[PDB]
Amino acid sequence: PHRRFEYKYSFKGPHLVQSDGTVPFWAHAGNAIPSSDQIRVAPSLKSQRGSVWTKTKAAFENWEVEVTFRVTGRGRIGADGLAIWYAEWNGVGIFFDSFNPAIVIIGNQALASCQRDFRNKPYPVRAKITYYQNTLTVMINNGFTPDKNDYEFCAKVENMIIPAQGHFGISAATGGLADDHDVLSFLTFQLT
């Protein structure tokens, strides 16, 4: 299909944050910390929660998001992970569950998943999440190459019905164990 880049549902560096500390077109809450080249959605502190989400709802029949992120921590084991979502919760989340690691599609029940280590990788991890003709597909570049087009399949759910309008967002959290959860970019495309 035709892809149209949708700026109002997207963020990226190298001038990600405005002078007043805000990300254009997105709200942030909790412990999320914007910076010029990434948003630290939850830092490596105990018991953190942070989120960033689009101020506008999108009403795209079909769409694709490309999210580039790092999850970094001192442990061979970390927590808790991050979630990429589309929600009116009512919608769908793609949960990167560190504490495994696995990547899980959850609708609102866990519908499908893959085992994939997305922590402490030499390059940013990239997730391409596509909603096209009621199929939700998750492709992952697991951070071992800098080729933006080098994805491996993770999981897919056919016959998925999600809200006709919704916000895009990212959430992250930590517990007793704590990684830095950084999102470098979130790029949204409408598909026709």
* Positions at the binding site for a carbohydrate: 47, 80, 175-177
Q: Which is nearer to another protein, 48 or 68 (CB)?
A: 68
By CB under 8 A, what part of segment 29-58 binds another protein? 55
The dihedral through the CA atoms of 93, 173, 168, 40 has a sign that is negative
Q: Which one of 5-13, 44-52, 92-100, 103-111 is the stretch in contact with another protein (CB under 8 A)?
A: 5-13
Among 53, 86, 95, 189, binds another protein (CB under 8 A): 189
**Contact yes or no for 43/31 (Cβ under 8 A):** yes
Say how many C-beta atoms besides its own lie within 10 A of residue 103's C-beta.
25
**Contact yes or no for 72/180 (Cβ under 8 A):** yes
18 binding another protein? (CB under 8 A): yes
12 binding another protein? (CB under 8 A): yes
7 binding another protein? (CB under 8 A): yes
In the complex, minimum distance from the CB of residue 66 to another protein, in angstroms, rounded to a whole number: 12
Query: Residues annotated in the binding site for Ca(2+), as ranges?
Result: 97, 99
148 binding another protein? (CB under 8 A): no
Q: What is the spatial distance between Cα 17 and Cα 52, in angstroms, rounded to a whole number?
A: 13
Q: Which one of 4-12, 63-71, 113-121, 131-139 is the stretch in contact with another protein (CB under 8 A)?
A: 4-12
Q: Which one of 3-11, 59-67, 73-81, 175-183 is the stretch in contact with another protein (CB under 8 A)?
A: 3-11
Whole-number Cα distances in Å, 91 to 150, 160, 184, 188: 28, 10, 24, 17
In the complex, minimum distance from the CB of residue 4 to another protein, in angstroms, rounded to a whole number: 5
- Look up residue 112 and give its DSSP letter: E
Query: Could you identify the residue written with the tokens 């030499």?
Result: 122
Whole-number Cα distances in Å, 18 to 13, 26, 72, 143, 184: 11, 11, 25, 28, 15
By CB under 8 A, what part of segment 55-114 binds another protein? 55
Among 6, 97, 179, 180, binds another protein (CB under 8 A): 6
